[PDB]
Design a binder for this molecule. Structure first.
Ligand SMILES: [Mn+2]
Length: 535
């Protein structure tokens, strides 16, 4: 499997590289390549100008694959290129504020080597569950990395007193008080005009924690953990469930219209569920599909890993994260059909609940149903189990695996195990989870199963020298996690627990106006959509 990954990365470096500057290329890479033509995936601007999309925030799995490949193979070329790419970004694409030209609304054109902004009214910095490889960055340039992290916090915190964050960060913003800002803890679900989204807080928690890890910065650690704790303090006193957000809308006006869901009318959950469920029916307490993926996977996996790695400095973080996942398993999970039940954090089961009025969560008449636990829950629950072997976390891992065609991992590790060695499962996430189960239990069947998945990944997803989700896909994504999974499998088998970075499920995206072939503008197009297109 190591030879395949080496082949693959060689292929990426051959076909995704800068071919626009003759014999003096930059080290930068295209995000996507059509494996049939070698054509690099382009952003098309309103006038028909074509940029080759180089978004460093959409390449941070590849940086990990590259470093992992070097550690396992002993070939230092891949590690060196990853380092060269970091160095070139600090040299050319880092603002005086410290922010990089990357993320949701900026990238670099590989052709011109100039920064781009595909969304003209949003020339801004955004990171959404990106989880960049700061370990590598600190290794290249510790000071420049620290400047990025301080500038990230400075740009994305609107009000330090109450920790109001923003999804969008302005470039060129002067340094404020930063870690020396005054904080005062507000009560659960205080009413405010702003909104600290969890998928904007995730990258803030992760970055400030890594600045602690590398520079022993007490200010960074304090604020990282304090921000994490904002989604913990308002948790339900009985159930320990929640919360998706920790504020509610400031009500300035009485509503006239169920279907007008503007925040000025007040918390949208209190409007639609409040009459029947009481004052605790609030947006942050709505444990619904998608929202629970953000809370109990996107956030939780990262906090689990941080809690562990922070050691003496992460005990509280880790406690909050494992306690939250345990509560969700206890209250909402159904292992028989592998579903989570829709709920309010106070413990109210909304399964088969008909919405009695229009609102933010659906039109009158909609029946709320249990939803299938996707593999983002498999990786968060298997990671949790690896740190704290609780039967409640096993329950979820077991239920999902069985629903994924993997057989029965047992009533507990090594007990009544009946895994399916003929599985056709080729999911990187399944591979990742099984490795965590193995490392917690030493039960050999779990790793034999992961080997099988790895073999399936190569047989069905290694295509034309790339990794693709389908054989018909137009463009391959150089940030594919298939080789990342294969590497962690190989590092387990070769007895190298330090060679490959624990998985955080980060990813990048690019969002803006994109010109269609007929010349029309498609507003808020994402590279995610481009990668789903077939030939
Ligand atoms: Mn945005």
């Amino acid at each position: 499997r190591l030879t395949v990954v080496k082949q693959y990365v060689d292929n990426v470096l051959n076909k995704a590289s800068d071919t626009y500057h003759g014999d003096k290329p930059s080290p930068l890479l295209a995000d996507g390549v059509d494996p049939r033509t070698g054509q690099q995936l382009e952003w098309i601007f309103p006038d028909g100008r074509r940029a080759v999309l180089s978004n460093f925030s959409a390449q941070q799995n590849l940086m990990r694959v590259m470093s992992g490949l070097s550690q396992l193979s002993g070939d230092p070329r891949y590690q060196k290129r990853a380092e060269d790419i970091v160095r070139y970004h600090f040299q050319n694409y880092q603002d005086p504020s410290g922010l990089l030209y990357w993320g949701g609304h900026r990238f670099v054109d590989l052709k011109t080597l100039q920064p781009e902004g595909p969304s003209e009214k949003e020339m801004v910095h955004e990171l959404k569950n990106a989880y960049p490889y700061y370990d590598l960055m600190f290794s290249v340039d510790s000071d420049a990395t620290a400047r990025f992290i301080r500038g990230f916090w400075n740009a994305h915190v609107y009000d330090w007193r109450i920790l109001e964050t923003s999804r969008h960060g302005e470039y060129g913003k002067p340094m404020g008080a930063l870690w020396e800002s005054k904080f005062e803890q507000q009560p659960p679900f205080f009413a405010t005009k702003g909104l600290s989204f969890l998928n904007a807080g995730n990258d803030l928690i992760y970055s400030a924690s890594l600045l602690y890890k590398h520079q022993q910065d007490q200010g960074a650690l304090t604020w990282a953990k304090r921000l994490a704790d904002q989604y913990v303090l308002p948790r339900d006193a009985k159930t320990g469930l929640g919360v998706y957000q920790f504020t509610q809308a400031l009500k300035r006006e009485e509503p006239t219209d169920d279907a007008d869901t503007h925040s000025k009318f007040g918390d949208r959950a209190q409007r639609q569920f409040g009459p029947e469920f009481g004052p605790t029916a609030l947006e942050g307490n709505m444990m619904l599909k998608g929202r629970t993926s953000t809370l109990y996977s996107e956030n939780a996996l990262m906090q689990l890993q941080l809690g562990k790695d922070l050691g003496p400095q992460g005990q509280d973080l880790l406690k909050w994260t494992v306690d939250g996942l345990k509560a969700f398993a206890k209250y909402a999970y159904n292992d028989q059909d592998n579903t989570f039940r829709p709920m309010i954090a106070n413990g109210q089961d909304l399964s088969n609940y008909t919405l009695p009025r229009d609102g933010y969560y659906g039109k009158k008449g909609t029946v709320l149903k249990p939803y299938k636990a996707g593999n983002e829950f498999l990786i968060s629950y298997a990671r949790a189990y690896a740190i704290d072997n609780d039967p409640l976390l096993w329950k979820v891992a077991r239920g999902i695996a069985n629903d994924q065609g993997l057989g029965d991992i047992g009533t507990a590790p090594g007990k009544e195990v009946k895994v399916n060695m003929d599985t056709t499962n080729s999911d990187p996430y399944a591979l990742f989870a099984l490795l965590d189960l193995y490392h917690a239990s030493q039960v050999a069947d779990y790793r034999k199963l992961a080997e099988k998945i790895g073999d399936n990944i190569i047989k069905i997803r290694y295509i034309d020298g790339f990794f693709m989700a389908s054989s018909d896909r137009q463009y391959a994504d150089v940030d594919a996690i298939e080789p990342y999974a294969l590497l962690a499998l190989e590092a387990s088998l070769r007895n190298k627990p330090q060679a490959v970075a624990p998985f955080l499920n980060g990813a990048g995206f690019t969002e803006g106006a994109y010109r269609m072939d007929d010349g029309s503008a498609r507003v808020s197009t994402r590279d995610n959509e481009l990668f789903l297109l077939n030939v």
